[PDB]
Amino acid sequence: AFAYFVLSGGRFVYASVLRLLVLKLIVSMSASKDVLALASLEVDLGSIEPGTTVT
Amino acid sequence: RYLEEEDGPLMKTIKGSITGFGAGTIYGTILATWKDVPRVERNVALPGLIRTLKMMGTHGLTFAAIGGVYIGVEQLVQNFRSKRDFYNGAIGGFVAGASVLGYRARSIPTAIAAGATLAVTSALI
Amino acid sequence: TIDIQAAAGWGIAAAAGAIWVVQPFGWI
Amino acid sequence: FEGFYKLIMRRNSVYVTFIIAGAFFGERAVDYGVHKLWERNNVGKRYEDISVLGQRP
Amino acid sequence: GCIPLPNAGDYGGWFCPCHGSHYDISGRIRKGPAPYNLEVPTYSFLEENKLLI
Amino acid sequence: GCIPLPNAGDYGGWFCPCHGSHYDISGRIRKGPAPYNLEVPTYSFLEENKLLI
Amino acid sequence: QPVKLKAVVYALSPFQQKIMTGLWKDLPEKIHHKVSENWISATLLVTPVVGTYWYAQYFKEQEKLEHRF
Amino acid sequence: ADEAEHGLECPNYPWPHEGILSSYDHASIRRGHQVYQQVCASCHSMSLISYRDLVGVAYTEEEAKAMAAEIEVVDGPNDEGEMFTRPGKLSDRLPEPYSNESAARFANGGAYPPDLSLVTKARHNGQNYVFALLTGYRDPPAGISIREGLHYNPYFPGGAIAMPKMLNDEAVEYEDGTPATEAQMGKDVVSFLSWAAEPEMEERKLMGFKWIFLLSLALLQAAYYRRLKWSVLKSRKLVLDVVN
Amino acid sequence: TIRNQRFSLLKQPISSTLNQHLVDYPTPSNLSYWWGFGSLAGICLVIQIVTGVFLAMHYTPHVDLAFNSVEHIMRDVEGGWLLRYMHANGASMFFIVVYLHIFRGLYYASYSSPREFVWCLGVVIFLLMIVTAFIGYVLPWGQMSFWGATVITSLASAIPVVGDTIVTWLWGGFSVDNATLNRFFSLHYLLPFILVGASLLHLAALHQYGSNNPLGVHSEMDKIAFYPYFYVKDLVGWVAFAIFFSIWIFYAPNVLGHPDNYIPANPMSTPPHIVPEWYFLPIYAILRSIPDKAGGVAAIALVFICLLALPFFKSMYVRSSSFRPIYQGMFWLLLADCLLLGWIGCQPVEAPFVTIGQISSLVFFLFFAITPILGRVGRGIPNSYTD
Amino acid sequence: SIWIFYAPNVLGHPDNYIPANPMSTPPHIVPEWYFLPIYAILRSIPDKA
Amino acid sequence: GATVITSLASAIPVVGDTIVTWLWGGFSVDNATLNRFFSLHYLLPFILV
Amino acid sequence: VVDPKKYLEESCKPKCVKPLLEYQACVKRIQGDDSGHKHCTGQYFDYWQCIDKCVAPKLFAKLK
Ligand SMILES: COC1=C(OC)C(=O)C(C/C=C(\C)CC/C=C(/C)CC/C=C(\C)CC/C=C(\C)CC/C=C(\C)CC/C=C(\C)CCC=C(C)C)=C(C)C1=O
Ligand code: HEM
Ligand code: HEM
Ligand code: HEM
Ligand SMILES: COC1=C(OC)C(=O)C(C/C=C(\C)CC/C=C(/C)CC/C=C(\C)CC/C=C(\C)CCC=C(C)C)=C(C)C1=O
Ligand SMILES: COC1=C(OC)C(=O)C(C/C=C(\C)CC/C=C(\C)CC/C=C(\C)CC/C=C(/C)CCC=C(C)C)=C(C)C1=O
């Protein structure tokens, strides 16, 4: 019983280490800070003739 | 009042070890000369000389250990903390005394007593 | 009737691990 | 530890869940403790302690 | 995520060339796999010939 | 293929930091693993200060 | 080829023994055993490195002084 | 020659960010940045730094928003196809003093004022060297002459630097009223330059203390696990028949 | 027995190969912790591949963008500073572990028969590691990277007739340029997979006869299963290695490197000090000790020739240095010599380092010249030391 | 060899020879021919999910 | 082609948009997507071997 | 007001009296030109290396 208690203490660290390394790789593929810094702007426009579509 | 030196923590430790080895050699020589020879070694010259040289070597090694670990731990404590007090060197004296003299005396209370005495002798310095 | 308890016990572990890897406390 | 053994170690499903909870809570507690040591050793050096923060003309 | 073709489809609006989504005049999905209508941004008229998003 | 540094070496010429090749003032190898002197290219003057390489 | 063997082995359960106390046991003799058997090996490894390092610093210090006006 | 070629070695200064649990002095980062944009930025670029980087480190979001708006950034082409100018935003990099390397050399007598984004990481003993160089302008030794346009600095390799001395007393005015002595500005600017080279240091150090401590517990458990599995082998009694 | 029913799943055909080669493989019971660096090197290879694949998701192999993409990795992508420092310092950890692994094989004479093919495959692996790590160091395109690639590709010019054409073919032009950097990136993604295959063959060759033991004797009488005894012993080394690795990553990420690589590559001006990574310094030292172009390259090849001819020397029938006092003493001198060569490579080419490097190079080659002589003389030890 | 030397572009589409434009969209967006059967099954169901 | 397939994850109701953005590396198909696709295109053939 | 660096360099001179005298000794011996060849870089470096080491641990205590 004491041995299982002691071994579980180090098992706490092993699970945390595996979770950290896996997560660090996954979040590295998320949007970078330079990408997120270009997500809000404003643009003004004018008028077009009827029956038409401007993009 | 202290401005006559070139220092160097590694050089300090090396020179402290060398000085301790010299002191231990001389002290072991004196100890060996003071004691008598056992009765079965009085008609033979060589074993007495061998025992004297062994005493010199042992005490030189022990005193060099003290003189090296003391200075090294004092500098390592004063470097990593970057403060100069008698608190640094007190810990070095404690660890040197405890470690080496408890290794030689083979006891924990003797190591603690040696560490306390060494810390006091460094605090008065 | 212990396979069912084995499934329920492992389901709790799977749920506990899921909340542990993904920690959606800011989503609940 | 036999009392704790009879409750957690009896089944591996419970033991695995215990390890998962220990990693979760243990990492959070260590993280909190490290941050407390970090704050105590760096008093007055944080961005929140800049006196003229928010007062640039 | 494709871009519907203007003036295409069978509802006079927009036709998506990727998987055949049809949108009407109002940009509402009528036939196709697209679940929602075209998103409407935040726009306003500062004058007769000035838009802003 | 390294670039010998100027005003360096044992002969007042060039010194290559990569493996200690010494070139004298005329660029001739005097010490080191380099087997050849520095390569002098084709060049000419124009009047007094226009050097064409 | 497997080996024919004649031996008797007695073993005790891992849960009937102390696990860690043996690291800090007869420590002074481990230090004695390590030093007394490996002192020649340590000398043959440390002396050339320290001797060569010291000589280089001695050479550069005398050379630096010789080039000083 | 012999010793001037490598230069005079810089000392070891007690930086506030030195230590396994020590952070940057964020007040000194803000002070150091004001030194940069008022003295250094006229000749040195910081092309790796954005205005959004200073947010949460030395300035608030609106403080840096206004800061970026003060500068004129090239943009375009517009619908007619012409490059235009717009006020700066948080995502904009710090402005370049010169349009290209050749323009920098022409304005500084053939010398290039290198990018300072990683200078404390691009020199041996980076923090100490930069502080020593800036505050180490003094007279040359006897028998040594400097060419016009060059200034003596023992810490610079060779002793002749095209940099003029710019950390003169009261060269900047601090917002917090700190006396802007040469040594004070030199310490603040290296603190800001240190952060720019390693902006992740505070997070890196927190991670190191957390995980080295946790792995040390795992090492203690690893030893128990190994000695538990091996105890049946290491305490076993082996009876054999041979003697010699 | 008749396998009519299904016993333990490990003995089923789905996992029988893994069971015999990993879980139940017979291993000498007296293996020390010096036998755990093989798994450490395998874990380092996996770490390098995993971190490298994710770093290649953000790196641009273009001379106009390579330096900035590395800085973008450090500053912009979340956790990118960790991936870069794990990869940069992982290459140093890989070489530290493999260098300790090679020296264990020298001390215990693990190259001797019947393990000659294991040693030879290890030498091929070592060459692959050197080429892989070198071309990776060029990728950031710093000052160290540019001038590092300039001379290694120039080493082919030592060949008299076709040396120049090989240099220009390796460059892809007339100078180290975007062509050199682009082809170095492709090879840096491929060679790590070739390293995986070579290590698997290396492992397979060792399993033919089993591992050597600290006593160097026949060990078939006291073998135990790799799992769990040497798994839990390897796990201790893995955690201890992680603490060592974490110290470098989180507190000293740039100590094992040079600040010159943080300056963008300048083809115009060479740095005053130009040195490779620390794990290439001993080879650098032997190269610079020969005052000749061709001689320097020949000596580098002679290093790997001597490492390849080591297992085939007619040697005595005693392996471990723990019973060979003369060979044991020479091993410690060789280790001190290899340390000295690395330190010499970090020094500029001038007195007294030229004389010291020449002597150190001679001592290194003397080790491989004296070892066969020790074996031939040592053959008559049992006939001269009588009971 | 017949494809490599005499019909090198028939198995593909010419629209990949136009540089990518995130603003305009081609009227004919199709995958490579070997993904076509999977593409047809996707388009048959009138629901994204 | 990349704009469509990377949008297939959006069929998931709860985390569909989160996976799409993480797959893209941003709010649209851009250099982040191309750079990560190149690395995966070098690795997958070895896994296929 | 007054630069703490300049003051601390002046007050560290009694700790570096030996190198300062040697540097002064070199200055006298090189006052003859000898074709503009002699200099005192080494003695200059030794003197300032001592002063700089004396000033560094006390400079930052006076700065904020
Ligand atoms: C009009 O519109 C259309 C097109 O345009 C013209 C088309 O061309 C096609 C044809 C396309 C296909 C048939 C392909 C669709 C099928 C699949 C499977 C998608 C292919 C998959 C992807 C693109 C996803 C790429 C994969 C990844 C990003 C994997 C991510 C994960 C990674 C890298 C690893 C995760 C990390 C960890 C778990 C951490 C720990 C890991 C370690 C290794 C240690 C169709 C249908 C279409 O309608
Ligand atoms: C506080 C303000 C400044 C700081 C902290 C600073 C920082 C630096 C640094 C770290 C170097 C590198 C030295 C080396 O390469 O060893 C340098 C070089 C240089 N600086 Fe700047 N800089 C400042 C302002 C200026 C100004 C105002 C000018 C010009 C008017 C200038 C021109 C140069 C030049 C020309 C060099 C290169 C000198 C040479 O290589 O010979 N700097 N600077
Ligand atoms: C297939 C697996 C691998 C891939 C995809 C890969 C990819 C990369 C990439 C993209 C870089 C540039 C980014 C950077 O500089 O940090 C790099 C750098 C590097 N790689 Fe790798 N690599 C791999 C395996 C290895 C291995 C096995 C080694 C060691 C033998 C290695 C050693 C290096 C080194 C030394 C650098 C330079 C580190 C520095 O920036 O200073 N790589 N690698
Ligand atoms: C990719 C790097 C390498 C890996 C992953 C690797 C892996 C291994 C493994 C797992 C073993 C068996 C367990 C052990 O003794 O540690 C082993 C044994 C061995 N390796 Fe390596 N190795 C590598 C590089 C080398 C190198 C460079 C050499 C030297 C040329 C070498 C020579 C040997 C020898 C001689 C053995 C037998 C050791 C013995 O049983 O006493 N290996 N290797
Ligand atoms: C100052 O100078 C120096 C450096 O600089 C800083 C160095 O770093 C190094 C370090 C280099 C060492 C130790 C040797 C590297 C060894 C090799 C073999 C690299 C050569 C390989 C290259 C260039 C790539 C391989 C090319 C291939 C396989 C062609 C591909 C073709 C096909 C697939 C068909 C040394 C010695 C050096 O003195
Ligand atoms: C008794 O025997 C054994 C040993 O003593 C000889 C050992 O030392 C070890 C421990 C060390 C090992 C296995 C080192 C081997 C490392 C190699 C070959 C390099 C890295 C390994 C990789 C990339 C795995 C490649 C293998 C496969 C099957 C591909 C699939 C893998 C992945 C996707 C990760 C083990 C398990 C072992 O049993």
Side-chain angles (χ1 to χ4, degrees), chain I residues 21-22 25 27 38-39 42 45-46 196 199-200 203 206-207 226 234:
Chain I
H21 288 2
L22 277 84
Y25 186 79
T27 314
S39 60
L45 189 43
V46 167
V196 169
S199 312
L200 287 171
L203 191 50
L206 188 269
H207 274 190
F226 186 84
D234 279 333

Side-chain angles (χ1 to χ4, degrees), chain A residues 26-40:
Chain A
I26 272 161
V27 191
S28 87
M29 284 168 78
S30 95
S32 79
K33 283 188 272 274
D34 58 280
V35 154
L36 300 182
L38 319 168
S40 291

Side-chain angles (χ1 to χ4, degrees), chain A residues 18 21-26 29, chain E residues 2 17-19, chain I residues 46 49-51 53-54 57, chain J residues 13 28-32 34-40 42-43, chain K residues 1-6 8 22-24 36-37 40 43-44:
Chain A
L18 167 61
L21 288 197
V22 166
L23 260 44
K24 278 294 157 63
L25 299 153
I26 272 161
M29 284 168 78
Chain E
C2 288
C18 287
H19 312 95
Chain I
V46 167
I49 290 167
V50 169
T51 51
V53 161
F54 280 78
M57 274 169 210
Chain J
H13 308 286
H28 185 213
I29 307 188
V30 280
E32 283 298 302
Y34 40 80
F35 296 146
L36 283 182
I38 304 206
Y39 187 50
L42 178 49
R43 298 177 344 151
Chain K
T3 310
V4 169
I5 300 325
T6 56
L8 290 172
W22 170 89
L23 180 47
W24 278 348
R36 81 191 38 200
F37 274 9
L40 287 170
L43 165 77
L44 285 175

